[PDB]
Each structure stands twice: as structure tokens, then as C-alpha cells.
Symmetry: C3
Subunit: 335 residues, 3 copies
């Protein structure tokens, strides 16, 4: 191997969490090594018990977030165990050449492959499976998509000469799902992805999802699994959608600094209510919390958010600010 740089192995963590990393760094370029192991599996996606033939990187929807810096090289070992039923590959939107890597990574069950790409573009980017032809959309909407973040070596900035630093980062992957129904309107179950294919493709081509979820299921980022923050903390929220548009919004908050197209060579917009994630992309928003309590993080098609699955919660700790908002008079009879 001609490339004589130091190598470092990083262990991935399951979304919505993100592996430990530096923002600004004094390190120089290195080869950062990752492993992804594909898993086909049947999962429950809603409160009613609907099942779904999922196909995943590393067992999760979305796949895990990789974090590197500009000028690093990213060397991924992609594994397709013999217990899976079909061929898979990987396309990095961050990479240059060979259909994002897809033309160099097609592997049958029982095989693995090693792909390296140079991180020449900064931002958040989708990665997804793309075997060929009609298999491309089917693998993606079955769950085979995640993201990678390529940070500047000096960290993030506001476009006006000031550093932005986040106290924590979360990754919200949004998935449009297509579960067929029978003639009485009930959702269908299947014993393998291959058995689900014909009915699923027929539904896909009509363009209307049955479910729109964060982190793989209705309610995944609520209750015991709500996102957390403190008043005064700056939180970065990375949002991806590999196939279909979304319009994120933080109920009771704002996007203080937003890269809706997701690329750090562009200055952020400021003070947004709602932003726009193009299908086939990742974007990012940073917010400094000012008030404690519950927030909902939604797509602002509210039918999708409340009725099809696309709501997360934040539970924020701290002291209420009565200057920013206050209930002057509680509910009372009309005089």
C-alpha cells in the first residue's frame, strides 16, 4: 500500500449518540478505520405491532454516524455475513469516483471488502446501499442508509470570524417506510425480504409512505429514550433523509445556526423556525437551550409528525426564564 500515513481504528456507537471525537484538532491527516456489518432482520415499527423486513448497516436504522476531519482518509471494512440473503454495497456521498464506492464494494453473503476514500469535502453527507437498478431504492427504503460528518480541522465557524463549539451532538435519521396492505386494509407480514419485495415495490412506485419514523420506529426518541440537554448548552442536531424531503422544526425553540444543505464551506443561516432537508442529503442545526422542559423535534408536515411516526422529544433541565415567556393570567371564565 503506497499510502504512508498513521492508522487509527474508531469504534462506532448506535444512533442517536455519536462516537467521541475532536472538533478543532492539532492532529494532521490520518487513515481512520471503520467496520460496518450488514444485518437483514424483521422488526416492529409501531405501537400496534406492525412488522417490517429491514436491511441495516450495523443493526440500526439509521446506520451509525462516522466523524472524521478534512484531509483524512476513511478506510471501511464492509462485511456481508453468510446469514444474509442477498448482495449489498456502499455509496458515500462524501467520496469522489466509482459511484461513491458502490462500483467497488458489491459483496455476496459470506464476503467482505475494504474501500478507502479521501475526505476532500466538508459537511454532513448520506451513505447508503445501491446494488443496481430497481434494487437501489428498495435497499435504501428498507433501512440501508446512514451518514458521515467531515469537520474542518479548525472546527466550525459562523462565517463572520467566530468559532462555534457544540457541547453535544445527536444524529436523527428519518426513514420513509412502505408497508403493503391487503384488500381489507390490514398491514401485511412476510417471512423474508425477498417475499416482501413484489408488494413493497408496487407500493413504493405510488410514492406515499405508510410510516415516517426517527431512529427506526414510532416513539424511538421519546420516553425513556428522549434526547437530553441543559439550559445553556449548545446542541448540534444532524438530520438525514436518503430518499425523501423533510422539514425539521424544534417546538418551543429555533435553529440558531443552520446548514440546511449540510456543507461547512457555506456560512450558516441564523434564527430559523423550520429548515429543509432535501431527499438524498444530510443537514445540521445548532441551538443553545434557554428554557427547561419538554420540546418536540418534528418534521413540520404535522400529519407525518403526529400520525405517521415522525416526532422526537427533548427533556431539558434548568430554571424557567419568566422574561422570555410567562403565563400572565391562568385559564379563567370569560368576563
Amino acid at each position: 500500500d503506497d499510502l504512508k500515513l498513521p492508522r487509527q481504528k474508531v469504534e462506532l456507537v448506535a444512533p442517536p449518540f455519536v462516537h467521541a471525537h475532536e472538533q478543532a484538532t492539532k492532529q494532521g491527516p490520518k487513515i481512520v478505520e471503520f467496520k460496518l456489518t450488514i444485518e437483514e432482520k424483521k422488526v416492529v415499527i409501531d405501537e400496534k405491532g406492525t412488522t417490517f423486513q429491514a436491511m441495516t448497516f450495523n443493526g440500526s436504522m439509521p446506520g451509525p454516524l462516522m466523524v472524521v476531519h478534512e484531509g483524512d482518509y476513511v478506510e471501511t471494512t464492509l462485511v456481508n455475513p453468510a446469514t444474509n440473503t442477498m448482495p449489498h454495497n456502499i455509496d458515500f456521498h462524501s467520496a469522489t469516483g466509482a459511484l461513491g464506492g458502490g462500483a467497488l464494494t458489491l459483496i455476496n453473503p459470506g464476503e467482505q471488502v475494504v474501500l478507502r476514500w479521501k475526505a476532500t469535502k466538508t459537511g454532513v453527507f448520506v451513505y447508503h446501499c445501491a446494488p443496481g437498478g430497481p434494487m437501489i431504492p428498495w435497499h435504501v427504503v428498507s433501512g440501508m442508509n446512514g451518514a458521515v460528518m467531515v469537520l474542518p480541522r479548525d472546527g466550525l465557524n459562523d462565517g463572520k470570524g467566530h468559532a462555534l463549539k457544540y457541547d453535544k451532538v445527536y444524529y436523527v435519521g428519518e426513514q420513509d417506510m412502505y408497508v403493503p396492505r391487503d384488500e381489507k386494509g390490514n398491514f401485511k407480514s412476510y417471512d423474508s425480504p425477498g417475499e416482501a419485495f413484489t408488494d413493497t415495490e408496487e407500493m413504493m412506485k405510488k410514492l406515499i409512505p405508510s410510516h415516517v419514523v426517527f431512529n427506526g420506529k414510532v416513539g424511538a426518541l421519546t420516553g425513556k429514550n428522549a434526547l437530553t440537554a441543559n439550559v445553556g448548552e449548545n446542541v448540534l442536531i444532524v438530520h438525514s433523509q436518503a430518499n425523501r424531503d423533510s422539514r425539521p422544526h424544534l417546538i418551543g425553540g429555533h435553529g440558531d445556526y443552520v446548514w440546511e444543505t449540510g456543507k461547512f464551506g457555506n456560512a450558516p443561516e441564523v434564527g430559523l423556525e423550520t429548515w429543509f432537508i432535501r431527499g438524498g442529503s444530510a443537514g445540521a442545526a445548532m441551538y443553545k437551550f434557554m428554557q427547561p422542559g419538554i420540546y418536540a423535534y418534528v418534521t413540520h408536515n404535522l400529519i407525518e409528525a403526529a400520525d405517521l411516526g415522525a416526532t422526537a422529544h427533548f427533556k431539558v433541565e434548568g430554571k424557567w426564564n419568566d422574561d422570555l415567556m410567562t403565563q400572565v393570567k391562568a385559564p379563567a371564565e370569560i368576563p
Copy 2:
């Protein structure tokens, strides 16, 4: 009450008009007082006589536009008369905390509540009802949404050191409506919002509206109710959509200065043909008219514009400019 600022009551006006206000101002912060009275009512929405179970702020779709300045406090008395049938509240996208105010403003029929929020973010913003769970999308698409504008104290600018001043402002609220049909394809009628709910929710979840209208009905901003201007006048057009994307366009004109994400801390884009309003947001465009006659203001999904209801007209007064455009030869036989 700890807050010792002067108070001023402002009377709202029905869309598409906007209450009188200053752009640049020499006044300091004040508490600006507004009242909204909720009205549930059955209305006619198209030329054919289709009826609709609407729920409104102040009797209109959209609710009226509130206009204040950065650093003001906005104190709203929300009234739910005893003649209404269910609970309602209000969520301001301009506000910080308590789900935009929604967690502090839930009122039953026969009750009123008073909410204050500080106007710390500049721009145009949606406000909407949001009672909880599946009621959130249903109240919004029934008509319970409007907007608020928070101006800089120095008025608007172009991002290049020049003031922009408008001669008039209009507010265009766009509403996606879901009217169910029976087995023969005819639109259904109902005697209350509660009776309409089950069939309406079933249709909502399929994501395709039956109607897309401006100012509450097909043709509302046409004919006797066309928008007006003169050649030489600078017109600001505020556009909101609380649930679903839109793509505004002025036929025969342009957006000279456009804030499509709607927030005045960002410089405007210039010289646009068509812009994009994310569902869950307000945006704004300014145009200086150069030619007299009729203009159509549309969403540029032309099926929605011409066939589902989403067309307004401007009738502009003044002298034709033959340098900008001219009919060199009138229709004639092909030689």
C-alpha cells in the same frame, strides 16, 4: 407584574390586509397587547358549493398578521367562547419555551388565557393551534394558523448597506384542505367538526389535499377582491403555510428581494423567478412593479394553482413600458 414597560393595545385587521405599523421606529421596547377570539364555523370553500368544518382565530383563514419590533413583548388574550365545542391553544414559532406557548394556553369553551413572550428573533413566523397528539395536525389543517412579523427597529435592509422600505404589505395564507368523499366520489357534508373528524383523519394520513386555497376559499383574492398596486410601488408579500410546502411565483414579475426561510438576520436573495415556503414556516418577497395590468400570484405546482384553488390576482395601475416588452407583430397568417 414585574415588567415595567409601557403598554399599547393594537386592533387586528382581516387578511390579506395588515394593521397599520411603523417600519423603522424611534420608539423603544413596549408591551404590545392583542386579542384573538376562536370561532368554529361551517364555510363554503369552492365555486361548486363544497362545505367545510373550519376552526379559526378571529373568524378568518389565515388568522390575522400581528406586527411588532425586535425586543417588544407580545401579550395575547386568547378567548374560547362557550359556543365552541372543544379545547384550543396557541403555539408561536417566534417565541421561546413551553412548546411555543402551547403548554401554557390550553382553554376549554367558556375560558380565556393571557400569554406574554419576548420578541427576540426577527422575521415572519407561523402561529397555530396545537392541543396535543393527533389533534395537532387536525386543528391546523382545519384553519387554525396565522403569522406574526417581528421587524428590526431600523426597518429592513438589503444586506449591502441599503434600506429597503415597502409602500404596502399583503399577507397571503395558504391552506391545504382535506374534504372526504363518498363511494360515488362526491364530497361529504357534516353538521359539526366532531362529526367530520374520523373521515377527515383517514384522508389526512394519505397526504393528498382536495383543495389548496389562499385566504380561505377558491377565488378569495380575485375579482372584486384582487390585490392592488401602482407602477413604481414596492410591495411586500408575506406567505405562510403551517403544514405543507409551497412554491410562490408572480406571473409577469419577479421576487426582487426574497427571504424564503423568512428571517431578517439573513440577507435576502435577489431576482428570483420562484421561491420555496417550507411547510411549518412563513417567508417574504418584495417586488417593485414596472408594468400595469393583471398578474397572477400562484404556487407553481400549476395543477394546485389552476385546478385545486391556489391563485390570487394583482390589478396594477399605470403606463405600459414598451422598452421592457412589446408585441412586435400581432397574430397573423403564417407566410
Copy 3:
């Protein structure tokens, strides 16, 4: 005729190619003369033999790209031959007044008209037929749309003081098509546009296309008709959509410089994965190729791209760059 400028006739070429022109120019304003001849015709749109009642400018979908400079006047002779069956006109989004020209250009079969407009706004812009009322969307989605590019006299720039020059330009026109089906689900055929109208309008109002194509048919920009480039060449890709949103992406590449709203008075964004074309607009992206081989140019709703028709190919010549990407280990058994 009061206007005393030199006149020059330019011959149009069929998409995706573009007539020869200058970027930066030392010429002053002139009257640039074009001719468009309308053709209604029955065409095959997919691999299966589905037919479609198309209506076109100059025999192509999209209509051809016109290229002029800021301050030119554009004088178009629009011809409606006697072999056509209904009235047509033209609306230029680049023009000011009279519904873009539509109110001055309505012509019956057997007639022609001459319209001039001044090119006061820079960028890429849609042009389309717009006869009136429900005919507007129907003519547009039948194929009656193209684009015009208005270049600055000094050529394009990056917003940071540097010239951008392209080595070639392609025009990709995307068309949403609505082909009705019968009760068994098979696509319907018709003997005239008038006969197709009733069933087509019923389908249009449901908002879901049967086909989404580039250059008028599935596969039009693939195989013998793939787009071409060399490693090291800067390629400008103009994309239009007159009725419905799109999200372009170059698989294995990026948008180095992107004007997604399409207007050259705005600085471009840099280093994009996927961009957004609002329905009713044209946008533009420039990319310098770094790797040889096949690329797919798609809308990144991958169901639309792979299953409904919306994929083009580039075949790029040159030497592989193993620093940017390399296959470290070929597929092998899992140890």
C-alpha cells in the same frame, strides 16, 4: 420600430446540447432573434411501449435552451402550424409584463406572433405555454416547457472575486407525466390530445405522476446518448422543472458551485451533495470531473430515479486517481 439596435438570428439546437455562444463578451446589447414552431405529436415514453399525447416547442421535451446576455433584447417568432389542433402561447419567467408574454402571444392553428422582451434579470429561467385556466397545467405537463439563460456580460463568478468558466454546458429538462390507466391497471392510449384530456385531468388532480423523465423518455440520456466529459473539464448542468420539485445529485461527484434558485445575482453555494429545483424554476450546477468512468445524474427520490424514469448517465474519459479512492482489498471470504 423605435428600437435601433443591431439584430442577430441564432439557430437553436435540440437538448441536451446548447447552441454555441460566448460566456464573457466584448459585444454590446443587441436584438437576438429566435423561432419556435409548436408540434403536437404522439410519442413512446418508456421501455414497455407506453404512448403519450405530447405537445412541444420545436419538437422536443424540453424545448431548446436559448442563451443571451444581460441587456440584450430577445425577439421570438412563435409559430402554430395548421396541422395542430388547439391554441397555444408562451410565458417567459425571464420577462417583465403581460403574464410573461402570455397575454400577447395566444395563437390559433395557422397563425404566428412576434414578441420582444428585455433581458433585465440574470440566471436560468423557465419558459412554458399558458393558454388560460385549466389549460395552463395541462399544456405544461404535456411537454410545453423549456428554458432561457441570461449570462452577465463578464461571464460567471464565484462571489469571491474569481471568474468561473465552463468547458461545456448541458440542459436537462425534467418532465412529470400523467398517463391514465384502465380498470385492470393498464395504461390507456388515445388518438389525439383532445381525446386524452378528460382522463388526464382527472389523474393530474390526484398529484402523482406515472413517469418522471429527462429529455422526454425513459433512458433518453443513457447508452448511445449518455452525456460525456473528460477528467479536468468543468461542466455546467442546467436543470429545469416547470410544474413539480426535483432534487438533483451526481452519483460519485458533487456540485462544486451551485445556484439552486438559478439566479446569477446571488453567489453560488459550494461543495453540495444534492440540491433542490423548485417546481416552476431552473437552477444550475458546475462540477470539475476528477475521476473517469460512469456517473449517474438523478433526482434523489430514488424511486423516481430508478423506477419512474429519472436517470441520466455521464461517461467520463481519463486516468483513475487512486489517492482520491481505491479498493484496498477486493471481495474475499470473511476470516
